[PDB]
Design a protein around this ligand. Sequence first.
Ligand SMILES: *[C@@H]1O[C@H](CO)[C@@H](O[C@@H]2O[C@H](CO)[C@@H](O[C@H]3O[C@H](CO)[C@@H](O)[C@H](O)[C@@H]3O)[C@H](O)[C@H]2NC(C)=O)[C@H](O)[C@H]1NC(C)=O
Ligand SMILES: *[C@@H]1O[C@H](CO)[C@@H](O[C@@H]2O[C@H](CO)[C@@H](O)[C@H](O)[C@H]2NC(C)=O)[C@H](O)[C@H]1NC(C)=O
Ligand SMILES: *[C@@H]1O[C@H](CO)[C@@H](O[C@@H]2O[C@H](CO)[C@@H](O)[C@H](O)[C@H]2NC(C)=O)[C@H](O)[C@H]1NC(C)=O
Ligand SMILES: *[C@@H]1O[C@H](CO)[C@@H](O[C@@H]2O[C@H](CO)[C@@H](O)[C@H](O)[C@H]2NC(C)=O)[C@H](O)[C@H]1NC(C)=O
Ligand SMILES: *[C@@H]1O[C@H](CO)[C@@H](O[C@@H]2O[C@H](CO)[C@@H](O)[C@H](O)[C@H]2NC(C)=O)[C@H](O)[C@H]1NC(C)=O
Ligand SMILES: *[C@@H]1O[C@H](CO)[C@@H](O[C@@H]2O[C@H](CO)[C@@H](O)[C@H](O)[C@H]2NC(C)=O)[C@H](O)[C@H]1NC(C)=O
Ligand code: NAG
Ligand code: NAG
Ligand code: NAG
Ligand code: NAG
Ligand code: NAG
Lengths: 257, 23, 49, 371, 49
Amino acid sequence: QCVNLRTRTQLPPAYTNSFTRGVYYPDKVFRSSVLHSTQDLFLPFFSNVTWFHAKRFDNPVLPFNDGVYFASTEKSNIIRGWIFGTTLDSKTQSLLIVNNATNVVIKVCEFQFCNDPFLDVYYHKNNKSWMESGVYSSANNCTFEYVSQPFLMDLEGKQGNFKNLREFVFKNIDGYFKIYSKHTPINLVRDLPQGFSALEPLVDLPIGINITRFQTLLALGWTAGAAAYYVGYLQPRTFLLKYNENGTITDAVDCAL
Amino acid sequence: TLKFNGLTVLPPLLTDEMIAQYT
Amino acid sequence: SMTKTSVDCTMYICGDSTECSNLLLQYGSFCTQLNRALTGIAVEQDKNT
Amino acid sequence: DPLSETKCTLKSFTVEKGIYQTSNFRVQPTESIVRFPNITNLCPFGEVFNATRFASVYAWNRKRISNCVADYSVLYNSASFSTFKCYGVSPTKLNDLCFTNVYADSFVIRGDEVRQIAPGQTGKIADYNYKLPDDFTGCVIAWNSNNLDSKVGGNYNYRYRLFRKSNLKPFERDISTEIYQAGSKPCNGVEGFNCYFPLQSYGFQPTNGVGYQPYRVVVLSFELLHAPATVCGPKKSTNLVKNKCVNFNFNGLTGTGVLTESNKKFLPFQQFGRDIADTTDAVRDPQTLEILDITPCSFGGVSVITPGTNTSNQVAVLYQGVNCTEVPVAYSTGSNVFQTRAGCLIGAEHVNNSYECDIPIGAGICASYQT
Amino acid sequence: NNLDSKVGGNYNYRYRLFRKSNLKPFERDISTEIYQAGSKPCNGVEGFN
Ligand SMILES: *[C@@H]1O[C@H](CO)[C@@H](O[C@@H]2O[C@H](CO)[C@@H](O[C@H]3O[C@H](CO)[C@@H](O)[C@H](O)[C@@H]3O)[C@H](O)[C@H]2NC(C)=O)[C@H](O)[C@H]1NC(C)=O
Ligand SMILES: *[C@@H]1O[C@H](CO)[C@@H](O[C@@H]2O[C@H](CO)[C@@H](O)[C@H](O)[C@H]2NC(C)=O)[C@H](O)[C@H]1NC(C)=O
Ligand SMILES: *[C@@H]1O[C@H](CO)[C@@H](O[C@@H]2O[C@H](CO)[C@@H](O)[C@H](O)[C@H]2NC(C)=O)[C@H](O)[C@H]1NC(C)=O
Ligand SMILES: *[C@@H]1O[C@H](CO)[C@@H](O[C@@H]2O[C@H](CO)[C@@H](O)[C@H](O)[C@H]2NC(C)=O)[C@H](O)[C@H]1NC(C)=O
Ligand SMILES: *[C@@H]1O[C@H](CO)[C@@H](O[C@@H]2O[C@H](CO)[C@@H](O)[C@H](O)[C@H]2NC(C)=O)[C@H](O)[C@H]1NC(C)=O
Ligand SMILES: *[C@@H]1O[C@H](CO)[C@@H](O[C@@H]2O[C@H](CO)[C@@H](O)[C@H](O)[C@H]2NC(C)=O)[C@H](O)[C@H]1NC(C)=O
Ligand SMILES: *[C@@H]1O[C@H](CO)[C@@H](O)[C@H](O)[C@H]1NC(C)=O
Ligand SMILES: *[C@@H]1O[C@H](CO)[C@@H](O)[C@H](O)[C@H]1NC(C)=O
Ligand SMILES: *[C@@H]1O[C@H](CO)[C@@H](O)[C@H](O)[C@H]1NC(C)=O
Ligand SMILES: *[C@@H]1O[C@H](CO)[C@@H](O)[C@H](O)[C@H]1NC(C)=O
Ligand SMILES: *[C@@H]1O[C@H](CO)[C@@H](O)[C@H](O)[C@H]1NC(C)=O
């Protein structure tokens, strides 16, 4: 059911510096005390990445090209899910990821969407806090379901008074789509942080579909919280990675920097 | 500051204590 | 003197496989030639010392 | 004997004094071991083959399947199917096989029509509602169900599609109830001469002749090997063995080594340990989570020490860097055995008296022939 | 065809459709014994599967 709002005209997108951010464990292999090099799609260090921030509301569509670093410094969980597909009309399958207060659903039915689809915090409609339907009409060719518990839950440190950064890498390769992530506390007004921490693989899914575009789903004549989200596109390069005595990636260098 | 695949390292006839002794 | 080294030429080339080891027999004496080359060095490390 | 193993390798009958290299020693794997993930989320076979009610064949069901394990042991091994035929696998091999998309079609027919569910057939069920393609590479499971679906008045709930303008395509389904025209005349309203309603309902009665009696069909259709695998047969696993050399497999990490318990702690997502060389040095157990050091099965040169054949035919053997405790797997009778920085030395005596070096054994040791 | 073939079927020529495995080089099997495609053992001249 479309609740259209063409309210904000397309604007000139902000850029911000991604420092030494968005490195992830290449494979499920422990290597320790060691300076291993590797080839995979990584975020180029120091690159400018597109900066968006939620009368502070941001909701654009944008393309996808092999892989993405998504990240958000946010308070009170306004951000919640993702659409990925190649046409977004039901000619093609398009996978959905939605999270609520706890649960995730992942679904690959050929959803027919909207120009401007989203879910807000459900009220009225069918009834308070409704099923994650509102983005689309048709399920009937539901090729896939999967579901999980806490995909993006809170961390305390006295009630999350800071903005706590949540980082996600989205990748499709060889018919596996894959996620890797981290959450951490920091005290910074408007940038993605200078500093270093690794994204571990969170989930994997044999979806096997062409994927080309994506859109963030964030909740709300209407009022809501407001914070930043960043998109950077991964690139085919070579890294040297330092794994500590405990076999965690503790520092990285980007050979082409 | 200092076996695999059929590759092997063989020990010296003059062990470091014998080298320490000749020296 | 440097570290003495010695190699099982079958275990390097054809490690845990008869199937490869047959295809290696076609080349004949080369593995023993390599072994001698390494056994020569290895005697000379004791000799130098 | 080891002396002949020199004479052979040196290609000589008399041999001069010295230490001589022969074939390498290498411990053989005590057994094969197979470690795989527990058989877990099984496929919906109880809802497919054990669903209380079936469809009619005209309106044949298509239960799509994904994200599960396809153990058939509670399937083929049970006598409850009078007609399970596979058409492109041994039905034994299914547990050791994998499938891409899966679609369980479920419906009821006459027993004398079950034959028409096999590929490349004719008769009203093949011709007008269900028709398998001539290269069908699924499997077909059917059974007499007289005692489940027959009715004393005839079970007219189940029904076939008797009339059709033309004979249909593989995996076409028709929900039309429009009136068939058996003549050249056009048909209008609901009924008339050579107007026919195109369905008919089965007289499945428990008294029916065998063949006539109702039969339940499940077609395990699957279209294969064009997308990433999301359903598979169960990868059977086996007890863990330790402190012995073995051919191992962990989750398709096939290899060989002595397995030992590791002190390394892996963060929850990891399963393998790799060295500076990027060679595999440790692995997690996929059932009973703990980390294991892979140590490649003990191996090293066999070197035969000898006085010249022009002097004596008594000899000794060095296993280079092997601990004596590993040699017995092979002169493993022992009797004269000594363990050294160089390896395990077999066939010789130790003497505290430091003679001058004679034959070098390495790592501070030499050997000689004396009273 | 002109020497060996007859209009209703010269079935005097036979091959083998099933076997315990793949025969070794220059091996000849004269066997006629009933093959077991099914799990069931099958004494006698015939049986289901
Ligand atoms: C449909 O559902 C039936 C009920 O679950 C199921 O019957 C079950 O069959 C199994 C295997 O034949 C039995 O398991 C036991 O088999 C013997 C005893 O007969 C024991 O030696 C074994 O250890 C094992 O416990 C179940 O007892 C039996 N269940 C009952 C109570 O009937 C059918 O097999 C199912 N069919 C399909 C197609 O799913
Ligand atoms: C969060 O989302 C989950 C997943 O969709 C919701 O769980 C479903 O809730 C309905 C109604 O109770 C059930 O019919 C489904 O079967 C549930 N799914 C599963 C997998 O159990 C949950 O209700 C949502 N919670 C909130 C607070 O929105
Ligand atoms: C969504 O439904 C359509 C139509 O049923 C599917 O398209 C079929 O795909 C199969 C497999 O490649 C082909 O054999 C058919 O010829 C296709 N039919 C049509 C009308 O295009 C499509 O695959 C479905 N997608 C998902 C994800 O289930
Ligand atoms: C690797 O991780 C271990 C475990 O977190 C660290 O060992 C801990 O060290 C702290 C501080 O001395 C102690 O409070 C803990 O008792 C230790 N844990 C254990 C299990 O003994 C270790 O310091 C880490 N190493 C590095 C280089 O970061
Ligand atoms: C594989 O299955 C076994 C059970 O069959 C699981 O191991 C059990 O773990 C619990 C909790 O420690 C014990 O009470 C049981 O005795 C264990 N069972 C056995 C047979 O040892 C194990 O968790 C399963 N594999 C995985 C990866 O979860
Ligand atoms: C050969 O291996 C044995 C073990 O099989 C070693 O014996 C161990 O030696 C240490 C140190 O004295 C003791 O703590 C252990 O209790 C011993 N184990 C056993 C099973 O006796 C032996 O030291 C090894 N020798 C060489 C030369 O490597
Ligand atoms: C970064 O953005 C600036 C605009 O502020 C642009 O001039 C520059 O070319 C960009 N560099 C890269 C590597 O994207
Ligand atoms: C809202 O109504 C639906 C039926 O439309 C019902 O299943 C659900 O439990 C209701 N939710 C609440 C919170 O009352
Ligand atoms: C989508 O997939 C098809 C088939 O694999 C391919 O031909 C086409 O180029 C793809 N399109 C894009 C935009 O990647
Ligand atoms: C070799 O053996 C012969 C007996 O066949 C013996 O007479 C001779 O002394 C030996 N020569 C050497 C070089 O030891
Ligand atoms: C030789 O001396 C060592 C001590 O250096 C002693 O341990 C060993 O038992 C002695 N061997 C004999 C045979 O007396």
